[PDB]
Design a protein around this ligand. Structure first.
Ligand code: ATP
Ligand code: ATP
Ligand code: DNN
Ligand code: DNN
Ligand code: MG
Ligand code: MG
Lengths: 224, 224
């Protein structure tokens, strides 16, 4: 079944918004979809335990009705690097558990999207990063680029490292994190030339609740 | 004579503030110093033409009295990627001119610091990036890390790419861009373990005019 890992040029660049757009587009194409956020930090308390907003957005945007834990096995309240809070709370993040969770979603979905945490190299322990897991799984990677000053360097750095790891950069998504700026078009042309992967689509600047905006239309799944 | 290229995990992470600290420390050590900002964007008009604040900070912090043009040959008013504004204004950025400017400073200084623009991969033309020039010059690189969420990934990405290019990562500087946060110490430990270069020093959060604060004391030049 189809599976993709979604990373970003940094934390807060739009991985979640783009992932929802990707999920909506797959559903529109006829796929039985599932979003997976194996490791999450920055979560709120609820009667059922801790709940992460990214995990909730991916869960809502999946065509299948999924249990929270199936979408997000590891939930930490504090919004910091996974490895720091995991060590402080004494709750190890295990590659095997993250991989088991992906297989579990594949029991019912034929199109799975995996959102990472932060950027490419976000640590999970003192000796293991998210990149290590993505490489282990041999997941094709989709790069979400928040269009802003500094994004060219970050996109280039991330694309080079992904390719070096022997992984496939399946595509990139341009996300308009802010209203139209002076050099928007020039940045889009530069990004298009430099990222060795197809531009899947561009998500407009959607001020109000973009996680729940109908954004699937901005993604051309046939380029993936 | 000694020469170092200063890059950062992104634009606006403190390359200029750290460069001033580095320059002050070298001067304290007895060196005849010179800061060099070959390419600059985001500049103000003056009676003498355009003037960039980074270039002005490096000029002020050099032990030698340097002419503005010697410090910054290429000055663009608009604060965007060098390649975009250079093309729009029809003023090509030439590797040869940038290299000639470095040699010119070396006529009088025995310790030269070169501040890049933006991050590692900032484009200078449609086919040439700053990284290309740094590689051509075989300059040892100092990585400035603005201590904040997302910096681990960026530091790791930049360090890997620099090493891959066959260049020497001479050291890194931790810059406190914001007041003390919850996981400061844990981030410093993670950064120290992961960056394959000596931590040269840490610049405290200095709210008021940090470019002109006495920061040389935070750098241990003997580790460089
Ligand atoms: N296209 C957009 N238009 C308007 N706002 C956006 C857009 N994309 C993202 N945002 C907003 O910017 C913020 C960051 O986006 P998002 O949560 O998707 O990023 P992220 O990369 O998933 O971050 P994290 O590393 O926490 O997983 C959010 O508040 C989001 O609502
Ligand atoms: N240690 C610090 N304490 C307080 N403020 C700081 C500190 N370092 C940097 N700043 C502020 O943060 C901003 C960015 O820093 P700086 O100009 O040194 O970054 P930069 O990486 O040189 O950016 P550019 O890519 O434009 O060259 C500036 O307004 C600066 O005054
Ligand atoms: C305006 C800004 N401070 C410039 N001096 C450097 C910006 C370069 C950004 C390049 C990129 O998008 O990676
Ligand atoms: C709190 C934040 N939104 C997290 N979900 C992801 C942050 C990871 C940052 C890791 C790093 O410093 O590179
Ligand atoms: Mg997210
Ligand atoms: Mg600067």
């Amino acid at each position: 079944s189809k599976r993709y890992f979604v990373t970003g040029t940094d934390t807060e660049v739009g991985k979640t918004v783009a992932s929802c757009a990707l999920l909506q587009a797959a559903k529109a194409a006829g796929y039985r979809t599932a979003g997976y956020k194996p490791v999450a930090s920055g979560s709120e308390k609820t009667p059922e335990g801790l709940r992460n907003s990214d995990a909730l957005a991916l869960q809502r945007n999946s065509s299948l009705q999924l249990d929270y834990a199936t979408v997000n096995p590891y939930t930490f309240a504090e919004p910091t690097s996974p490895h720091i809070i995991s060590a402080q709370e004494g709750r190890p993040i295990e590659s095997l558990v993250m991989s088991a969770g992906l297989r579990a979603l594949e029991q019912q979905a034929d199109w799975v999207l995996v959102e990472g945490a932060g950027g490419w190299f976000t640590p999970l322990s003192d000796t293991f990063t998210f990149a290590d897991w993505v490489t282990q799984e041999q997941l094709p990677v989709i790069l979400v680029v928040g269009v802003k000053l500094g994004c060219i360097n970050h996109a280039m750095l991330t694309a080079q490292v992904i390719q070096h790891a022997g992984l496939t950069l399946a595509g990139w998504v341009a996300n308009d994190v802010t209203p139209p700026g002076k050099r928007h078009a020039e940045y889009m042309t530069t990004l298009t030339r430099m990222i060795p992967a197809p531009l899947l689509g561009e998500i407009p600047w959607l001020a109000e609740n973009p996680e729940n905006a109908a954004t699937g239309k901005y993604i051309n799944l046939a380029l993936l």
